[PDB]
Design an enzyme around this catalytic site. Sequence first.
Site, short mmCIF file in Angstrom:
data_model
loop_
_atom_site.label_atom_id
_atom_site.label_comp_id
_atom_site.label_asym_id
_atom_site.label_seq_id
_atom_site.Cartn_x
_atom_site.Cartn_y
_atom_site.Cartn_z
N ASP A 35 0.63 -1.21 0.09
CA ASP A 35 0.08 -0.02 -0.13
C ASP A 35 0.74 1.28 0.12
O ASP A 35 1.51 1.61 1.05
CB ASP A 35 -0.91 0.08 1.25
CG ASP A 35 -1.61 1.35 1.44
OD1 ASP A 35 -2.09 2.03 0.58
OD2 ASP A 35 -2.17 1.09 2.49
N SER A 199 -1.81 16.20 -11.31
CA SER A 199 -2.05 15.83 -12.47
C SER A 199 -2.39 17.37 -13.38
O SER A 199 -2.77 18.15 -12.77
CB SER A 199 -3.33 14.88 -12.84
OG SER A 199 -3.76 14.63 -13.89
C1 LIG Z 1 -11.56 -4.52 3.02
N1 LIG Z 1 -11.16 -3.64 4.15
C2 LIG Z 1 -9.89 -4.16 4.78
C3 LIG Z 1 -8.77 -3.79 3.75
C4 LIG Z 1 -8.29 -4.62 2.85
C5 LIG Z 1 -7.05 -3.88 2.34
C6 LIG Z 1 -7.11 -2.89 3.17
O1 LIG Z 1 -6.26 -1.59 2.90
C7 LIG Z 1 -6.73 -0.35 2.67
C8 LIG Z 1 -8.15 -0.25 2.42
C9 LIG Z 1 -8.41 1.25 1.91
C10 LIG Z 1 -7.41 1.93 1.78
N2 LIG Z 1 -6.07 1.67 1.85
C11 LIG Z 1 -5.86 0.56 2.27
O2 LIG Z 1 -8.13 -2.63 3.96
#
Ligand SMILES: CNCc1ccc(Oc2cccnc2)o1
EC number: 3.4.23.22
Length: 330
Positions: A35, A199
């Site tokens: 992420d 952007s």
């Molecule tokens: C499905 N909710 C839990 C989940 C899966 C992946 C992530 O991680 C995230 C979700 C939204 C934004 N950034 C990271 O959370």
Amino acid sequence: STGSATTTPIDSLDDAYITPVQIGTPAQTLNLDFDTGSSDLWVFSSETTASEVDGQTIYTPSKSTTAKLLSGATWSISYGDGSSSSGDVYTDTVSVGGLTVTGQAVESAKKVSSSFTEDSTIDGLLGLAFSTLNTVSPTQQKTFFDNAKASLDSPVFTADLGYHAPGTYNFGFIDTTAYTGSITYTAVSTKQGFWEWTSTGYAVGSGTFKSTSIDGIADTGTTLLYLPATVVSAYWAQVSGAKSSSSVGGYVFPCSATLPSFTFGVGSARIVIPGDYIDFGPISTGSSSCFGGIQSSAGIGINIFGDVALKAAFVVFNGATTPTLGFASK
Ligand SMILES: CNCc1ccc(Oc2cccnc2)o1
């Protein structure tokens, strides 16, 4: 040194991507959600509340000869989607695609919210935003990239996400066979802890390009593309029957529709998102109402260039002393 790992969609919709990560000695392999919108490396573990684990692979620090409790450190995080997790911290050896970091803070979950529990394919997250966002207290910790940076041949990582297909995360080098044309680099702001850039504009389908600055973040941890309401309205107005639904939570469109592409500007260059990338399928099983891949950022407080957008490019996260972002077509 370098690393190279395959990233795989967790489902038929590319709702997220998982990458195998080796943790501890002997290796424990967990599939983590890389992420670039957060900065904690956290995992399901032997410490996670039993009822909150359902199918996930867990990290057991007691089985790792190189794990060490980071005494008194705790962590707590909440994401843009409403999810959250918290727990304690170990340091351990962490390797990604042959690239190894010793002494990496591995944040062990004691608690996770229901959406985490509910997703058996994600064993935790590996943050790749700037370390200033890391939630460990009282001693903030460094991300994997940050720890590895010194060792890398070049202080960069790249995201090459697939559409309905595997992709690649590379560390310490740029694979010139992975993209077409040239890479256009653009300035980054680190002040909010994100890979925040601007952007130069957009186009809808074969429409003329609108030159306008749109501040946003490159966020592989976010599924969709979140943009100002003006931009998003202009897009969906080109789709017969498309509507914003408060009960559903955003723009939906007839599942019979063929979607137009969406172009975004990177300096003088243009990245084109094919219309099929913007189709996130029935809002509910069997429904003829489909959920859109471009949504309003109104109410988020930030624009987000999530997977829908990033997967249309080869993206370079340059963590040099002055970080920048590079985009290429592929
Ligand atoms: C499905 N909710 C839990 C989940 C899966 C992946 C992530 O991680 C995230 C979700 C939204 C934004 N950034 C990271 O959370």
